[PDB]
């Protein structure tokens, strides 16, 4: 029989909005979920969504015959610069399906062999950076992880070197993209967007879009002119056919997309992993021992990364606790009932609150808050739709294998090359942008004097 949908405190015509008067809205919604349970309605002026937190409801939402990816308002604003790349396209846009079909084989686990040398290139740069630090100095963790992931995606995506490890101020592309991402997210909590006070924001937003497009269009053009074949996604996209290839502007949007979709999620994952590693020294030692036992050569080979099983488990456990893209939106394809209790109208939006999902005690046990890579010892033991840091179904993360291969490589290399110290007894503080990251996370890395 039909249930009254829980909803948190309403504030007259502001609805539930004031509850998100915070720079930590995801963490705020987690607290609401902890109070209200597996499902709640959340209203703002002109907006309604329902937050799902239980594996039970989310498995059902994960039925693609019943629910399909929705573009959240975040994605709708990101779309201004990510256009109709995969991430910000409706499933029923032909460019979604076309691009999806073309790119998927180039994002497979098999394809990761072709990117490995480039990820190694940037990973070695990270290690060398840290090798070259003076004895007193520390590492700004998410800061260097983001240098690494932006560079790695730049290099594998379109053979472009941002050379973030050569700079204080990032490449102009990266400044524009990060500033564009920031504006997209600032627009979520902007009630009066037409306030002249934002004219400069709007001018800057346009400048940043032009910077991104010009760089990527130039490089696409240079490649189409040379016909050079390389190991990058760009080569795949230029060669792909559905009969017709992606047009050059969609390819630009996919390159921009891989950067937006991948850089911070992946850098956050590395940061959260290392955080959990230093806060659990017995896990760190097990991981460090595997890295030494497995990464026997100066350069990690593709095959060796695949053998870093425990590193893989540490990464999944960090993803369980702090999925760095913590929410994704769905809509009801038809009027339906969710969970046998909650009627939904065609077009009704649902948000999957991934960190809450991942703390479903009926699935994981009472110890959900504890960092235990061992949960992942046997992945077949994890129920369907219990673990969703990479989204769902045909709209799941296309970069999942790339991200995990990257993160495993890099984590492996860090563990092989350094002993790490939580010199500040760092206190977890999760900054929310469009992704999650442990802000201010700093460590000291003491080199084991192992040559590369
Ligand atoms: C730990 C790292 C990552 C996490 C946690 C993550 C998470 C996600 C999630 C949750 C989605 C689905 C969002 C939704 O339903 O609206 C998604 C989609 C996507 N991601 Fe990832 N991502 C990661 C790394 C990457 C990387 C490295 C790339 C590119 C190389 C990438 C490219 C994409 C693309 C193109 C989509 C859209 C897929 C589609 O709808 O066809 N991601 N990601």
From Swiss-Prot:
Reported biotechnological use: This protein is a target of protein engineering. Its selectivity-directing and activity-enhancing mutations have been extensively studied and the designed mutations allow this enzyme to act on non-native substrates and/or in order to enhance production of synthetically desirable end-products.
Binding annotation for heme: 397
Domain of life: Bacteria
Result for mutant: residue 398 to E: Ineffective covalent modification of the heme macrocycle. 2-fold apparent limiting rate of flavin to heme electron transfer for arachidonate-bound enzyme
Chain segments annotated as transmembrane: none
Coiled coil: none
Result of changing residue 82 to I: No effect in binding affinity for laurate as substrate. High coupling of NADPH consumption to laurate formation. No indole hydroxylation. Favors omega-2 hydroxylation
Phenotype for residue 261 to Q: No effective fatty acid oxidation. No effect on electron transport from NADPH to FMN. Nearly wild-type level of high-spin conversion with laurate/dodecanoate, palmitoleate and arachidonate
Site (Important for catalytic activity) location in chain: 265
Region (Cytochrome P450): 1-452
Phenotypic consequence of residue 258 to E: Ineffective covalent modification of the heme macrocycle. Substantially slower FMN to heme electron transfer for the arachidonate-bound enzyme. Product distribution biased towards omega-3
Outcome when changing residue 390 to H: High substrate-free turnover rate constant. Negligible substrate-induced spin-state and substrate-induced heme reduction-potential shifts on addition of saturating concentrations of arachidonate
Impact reported for residue 261 to M: No effective fatty acid oxidation. No effect on electron transport from NADPH to FMN. Slightly lower high-spin conversion with arachidonate, palmitoleate, palmitate, myristate and laurate/dodecanoate
Protein induction: By pentobarbital. Expression is negatively regulated by repressor bm3R1 at the transcriptional level.
Outcome recorded upon mutating residue 265 to A: Contrary to wild-type, significant decrease in the formation of the high-spin complex via substrate binding, and decreased substrate-induced reduction potential shift with saturating concentrations of arachidonate
Annotated compartments: Cytoplasm
Functional summary from the UniProt entry: Functions as a fatty acid monooxygenase. Catalyzes hydroxylation of fatty acids at omega-1, omega-2 and omega-3 positions. Shows activity toward medium and long-chain fatty acids, with optimum chain lengths of 12, 14 and 16 carbons (lauric, myristic, and palmitic acids). Able to metabolize some of these primary metabolites to secondary and tertiary products. Marginal activity towards short chain lengths of 8-10 carbons. Hydroxylates highly branched fatty acids, which play an essential role in membrane fluidity regulation.
Entry similarity comment: In the N-terminal section; belongs to the cytochrome P450 family.
Protein's UniProt name: Bifunctional cytochrome P450/NADPH--P450 reductase
Species annotation: Priestia megaterium (strain ATCC 14581 / DSM 32 / CCUG 1817 / JCM 2506 / NBRC 15308 / NCIMB 9376 / NCTC 10342 / NRRL B-14308 / VKM B-512 / Ford 19) (Bacillus megaterium)
Full-length numbering of the shown residues: 2 to 456 of 1049
């Amino acid at each position: 029989t039909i249930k009254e949908m829980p909803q948190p405190k309403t504030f007259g015509e502001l609805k539930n909005l004031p509850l998100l008067n915070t720079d930590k809205p995801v963490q705020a919604l987690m607290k609401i979920a902890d109070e209200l349970g597996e499902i709640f309605k959340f209203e703002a002026p002109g907006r309604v969504t329902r937050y799902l937190s239980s594996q039970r409801l989310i498995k059902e939402a994960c039925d693609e015959s019943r629910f399909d990816k929705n573009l959240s308002q975040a994605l709708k604003f990101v779309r201004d610069f990510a256009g109709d790349g995969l991430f910000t396209s409706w499933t029923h846009e032909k460019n979604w399906k076309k691009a999806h079909n073309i790119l998927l084989p180039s994002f497979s686990q098999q394809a990761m062999k072709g990117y490995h040398a480039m990820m190694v290139d940037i990973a070695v740069q990270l290690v060398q950076k840290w090798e070259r630090l003076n004895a007193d100095e520390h590492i700004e963790v998410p800061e260097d992880m983001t240098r690494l992931t932006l560079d790695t995606i730049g290099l594998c995506g379109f053979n472009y070197r941002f050379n973030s490890f050569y700079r204080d101020q990032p490449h102009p592309f990266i400044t524009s993209m990060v500033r564009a991402l920031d504006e997209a997210m600032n627009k979520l909590q902007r009630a009066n967007p037409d306030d002249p006070a934002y004219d400069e924001n709007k001018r800057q937003f346009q400048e940043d879009i032009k910077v991104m497009n010009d760089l990527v269009d130039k490089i696409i053009a240079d490649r189409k002119a040379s016909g050079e074949q390389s190991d990058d996604l760009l080569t795949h996209m230029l060669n792909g056919k559905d009969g017709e290839p992606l047009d050059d502007e969609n390819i630009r949007y996919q390159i921009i997309t891989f950067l937006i979709a991948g850089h911070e999620t992946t850098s956050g994952l590395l940061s959260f992993a290392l955080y959990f590693l230093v806060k659990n020294p017995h896990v760190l030692q097990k991981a460090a021992e595997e890295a030494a036992r497995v990464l026997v050569d100066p350069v990690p080979s593709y095959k060796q990364v695949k053998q870093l099983k425990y590193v893989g488990m540490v990464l999944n456990e960090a993803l369980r606790l702090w999925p760095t893209a913590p929410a994704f939106s769905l809509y009801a394809k038809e009027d339906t009932v969710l969970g046998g209790e909650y009627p939904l109208e065609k077009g009704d939006e649902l948000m999957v609150l991934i960190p809450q999902l991942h703390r479903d005690k009926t699935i994981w046990g009472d110890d959900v808050e504890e960092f235990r890579p061992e949960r992942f010892e046997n992945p077949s033991a994890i129920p369907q739709h219990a673990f969703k840091p990479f989204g769902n179904g045909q709209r799941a993360c296309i970069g999942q294998q790339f991200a995990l291969h990257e993160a495993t490589l890099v984590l492996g290399m860090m563990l092989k090359h350094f002993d790490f110290e939580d010199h500040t007894n760092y206190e977890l503080d999760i900054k929310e942008t469009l992704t999650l990251k442990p802000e201010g996370f700093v460590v000291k890395a003491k080199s084991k004097k192992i040559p590369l």
